[PDB]
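[SOLVED] Need 3D model of a three-part complex

Original post:
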Amino acid sequence: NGNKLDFYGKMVGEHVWTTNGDTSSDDTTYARIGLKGETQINDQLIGYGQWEYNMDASNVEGSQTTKTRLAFAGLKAGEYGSFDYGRNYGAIYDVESATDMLVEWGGDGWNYTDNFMTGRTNGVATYRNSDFFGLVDGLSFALQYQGKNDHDRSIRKQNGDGFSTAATYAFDNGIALSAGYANSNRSVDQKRDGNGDKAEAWATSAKYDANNIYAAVMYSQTYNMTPEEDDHFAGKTQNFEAVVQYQFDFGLRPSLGYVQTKGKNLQARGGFGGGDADLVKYVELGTWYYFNKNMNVYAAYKFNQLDDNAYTRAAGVATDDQAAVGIVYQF
Amino acid sequence: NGNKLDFYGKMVGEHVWTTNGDTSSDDTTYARIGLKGETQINDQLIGYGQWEYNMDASNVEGSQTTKTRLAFAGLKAGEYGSFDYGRNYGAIYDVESATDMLVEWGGDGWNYTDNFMTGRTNGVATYRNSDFFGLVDGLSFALQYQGKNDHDRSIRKQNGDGFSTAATYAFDNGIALSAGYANSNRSVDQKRDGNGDKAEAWATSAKYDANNIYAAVMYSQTYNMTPEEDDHFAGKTQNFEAVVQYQFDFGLRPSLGYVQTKGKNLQARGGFGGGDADLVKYVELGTWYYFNKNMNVYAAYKFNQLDDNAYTRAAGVATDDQAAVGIVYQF
Amino acid sequence: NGNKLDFYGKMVGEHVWTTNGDTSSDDTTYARIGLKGETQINDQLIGYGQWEYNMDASNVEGSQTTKTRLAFAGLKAGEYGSFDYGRNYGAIYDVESATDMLVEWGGDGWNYTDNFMTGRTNGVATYRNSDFFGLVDGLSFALQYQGKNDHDRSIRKQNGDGFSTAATYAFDNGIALSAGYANSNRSVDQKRDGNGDKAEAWATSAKYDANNIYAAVMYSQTYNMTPEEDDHFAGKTQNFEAVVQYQFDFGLRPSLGYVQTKGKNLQARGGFGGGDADLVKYVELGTWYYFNKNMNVYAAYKFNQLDDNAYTRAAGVATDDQAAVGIVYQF
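Solution:
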C-alpha cells in the first residue's frame, strides 16, 4: 500500500457554428479519460505516471480518431525537483497556460500540438523544481530537452534536437510573473525552405488571480517555429494574448479574451505579394455556468477580426465568426 | 460525495460462420468498456454523462478499429424530464428496442448506425420524459433533433437537419405498446439521386414480457431513409420483425426471431431491371445459457431466406445462412 | 457480490537508438491498460475475462495506433481445468515465455504477433490445466485450436485452421522444463509460394529461477511458419535463445541475452543465390533498476551480429546495433 491511482475524465457534448460567409454547423462531441499514478518509494522519493486519452465521438463509427495526448513517467525528490519523460506539454507552454483559460478557443496562435515545444509533443525529458531548491518561495522553473522527430510526419510537425525553459515567480497576494525561451534545430526537411537552420521563441506572461477575478496577459515572439495554414513557417511572429474573467459564487463565470498573432517577413505565394500579415486576430466573449465540480455548461462567440485580403486568400485562413455551446460531465 | 461512477463492459469471445455457398469462417471477438456518471446538483436537478467504447480484437494488431458508440451529457429535472446531447441512440430506435433482443442478429433491416436516427448517430439533442410530466403512469416519450452531417462522410452515412419522436405506453400486467416517427432533410449530396428531398419513417411495436415469456412484434415503413448494400437508398421500405423467447429457471433461454425488409420502387442497376425486392429476410433460431449476471454462453443459426435473383446479384446482398457461437464476461 | 475487477497497466517513457550505419533516434513511449474479471458462478466453477489495450504515444496526435493485444473470456472449473476463447497468446508461446524475459528485445526470432500461434493471435480456443487433473504437482499443459484467418490481412499474417499444445513440468527446487508443438494449415494465399501446404513448429525450454538467479534456455525449429523481412516464409528454421539475469538486493538486475534464428533452404531472390542464412542473431546486454514493484528504470544495448551479406541485402534485414533507455510506472 504505497500507491495512489486516480481516474479522471469528461464527456463533452459540444457544437460549433461558423456564422459569417462560409457558414457551417458541426458536432464536436468527444470523451476524455486519463489516469494519474503516484507511488511512495521513499520518504525522500516519489515515482509517478500519467496518461490521457481523447476519443472523438464526432465522426461516424468507422472513422473517429483517438489521440494519446499525455503519456509520461517520472521521479520526484523533494527540493531536488522532479524529472519526467514521454509525451508532455513543452516547458514554454507554462508561460502560455495563464492565457489559455478561454471557453472554446485560446492558444490558437503560436501554440500548436506537435510543434517543437509550443504545446504537447513527443520525446520530452523535462526537469522541474518548485521553490528553487528550497531557497526562494514561489519561484518555480522547468528545463526541458526534446530529441529529433524527423521522418514519419509531415514537415509541419517535425523538429530537430532542441531545448526549452520556463520560470514562474508567484507572489503571495495573487500576482504571478512568468517567462520562458526555446531554441531548436530544424529538421533536414524543414531547412529546404531556406528560412534558416534554427527555430526559436521567447515568451513572457503575467496573471492576477484573486478575489474571484482572473486577468492574464501574454506576449511572445517566434522565429521559424510557427506554422501557417499554408504549411510554410512564419519566419517571425509577434503574439499577444489577454484574458479577463470573473467568478460569481453561484456558478457563473463570464470571460473576455483577446488573441492576436502578426506574421513578419512572410514569403510570397499566389495572390500574396508582400510579407506582413495577421495570422490570427479574434475576440472571444463567452461564459461558463458551473453547477458543481462534476457538471457544467458553456457558450462562447468568436469575433474573427481577420479581413479577406491577399494573405488570407493565398494561405487559406478562415476569416469568419464562430459560436460554440456545450455541456460537460466531468469526474 | 454527491456523485456516482459506474464502469460497465464486456469481453466477448465470438465466432461466426457462413455455412452455404460462399462459405467463410471468421473471428469477431471484441471488448467493450463504458462509463456512466450521475451527479446530484440539488434536490430538483441531476447531471449525467455516458461514454461507451468498443474495441475490435478481431483483426491483427495494427488494423483493429475502435469505436466510440455513445458519448453524451445531460441534465435531468424530476418530472420536467431530461435533456442530453451528443452521440446517442436515435429516438425512433425506442420502437425497435423491443424486437432487437436476438442472440446474434436483430435490427439489421431498417436500423443502421449513422443512418439519420434509426440507430446510434452524431449530434442529437434528445428530450425524454417518463410518466408524461407526472400525469400518466407508464407513458414515456422522447423528442429529438439532429443537426446536419453533410461533408466528411460517405453519402450513405449523411443526413440533413431533422427530428424524431417516440412514445411508449407500458401496462402493469406486462404488455407495452410503442410508436414513433421521424422526418429529416436529406443532404445536398443525397438529393442527386432524384429520389426526393426528405427522408421519413414511422414505426409501431408491441411487446409482452411476463411469466418467463418474451414476445415482441414490430412494423415500420421508411422513405428515402434505408440504405441498400449498393449505397442507393430505398425509396420505400416495409419492415416487419418479431421475436419469441422463453426463460427456463436453470439458465437456458431459447429464442426464435423473424426479420424482413421489403424494398418498394427500387432503382434499376446492373442485372436488376424492376423495382420490388426483399432486402432482408431471415429467421434466427438461437439460445443463451446464463451462468449468472456476469457470465453467459450463446449460439445461434440464421436461416437466410433471400433468393439468388436479379436484385441480390446487382446490389451484392448475401443470400447465405450463418451461424454464431460466443462466450461473454460481463460487468 | 461474487465478482472481482482488477485494473492493471503501465506508462512507459522509452527511447531507442540505432547506433551503426543507418543511424536513427526515436521515441517509443506508450501506455497500456488492462482489465481482469473473475466471477464466482458456484463452488466448483469460475467465469473470467481479460482485455489488454496498448496506446502508442509516439507518433503525432493525428497518427498514433492503438492495439487490443488480449481479449478473451472463459470458464475455469478447479482441477477439470480452464477454457477460454478470443485473442490470446498461442500455447507454444508457453515454451518461449521462459526466454522472453529481456529488457527491450527478446522473442524477435521465431515469435511474431499474428503469426499462426507463435505469439498473440486471433480466434484461439485454449484449454489449460495445471497440476494434471490434480494428479501430478507442477505439471501443467495447454491444448489450443485456431480457426482460419484467410482474407482481410497481408499474406504475412494469415493462417489456416490449426492447433498447438504445450506442457511444462516445474520442480519445487526452482527448475522448470517445458516443451510444445504446433501444426497448422496454411492459407490458400500462402500456398501460392509452392513451399508446402502445412506449417509446423516444435519447441523445448528449460529455466532455473531461485536465489536471485534467473537462467533460461530455449531451442526450436519451425517449418513454413516463420516470416522473413522479405514476406517470404522460411521453409525451415532453427532457433536458439538463452538468458541469464541476477537480482541484487539493492534493486539492480543485470541481464545477458542471446537470440539466434538460422534459416535453412531459403528461396533465391535478388543478390541472394543460395539457401542458408541467419535471420536474427544478437546479444542483449541490459539492466533494470527496480525502485519498487510500481516503478523502475532500465537500459539495454543490442549487439546485432548479422553480417552485411547477399541475404541481408536481398531480404532487407537490418544488421545494425541498437540501444534503449526507459522509465516505467506500473500498477
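Edit: The helical segments of chain B are 93-96, 310-315.
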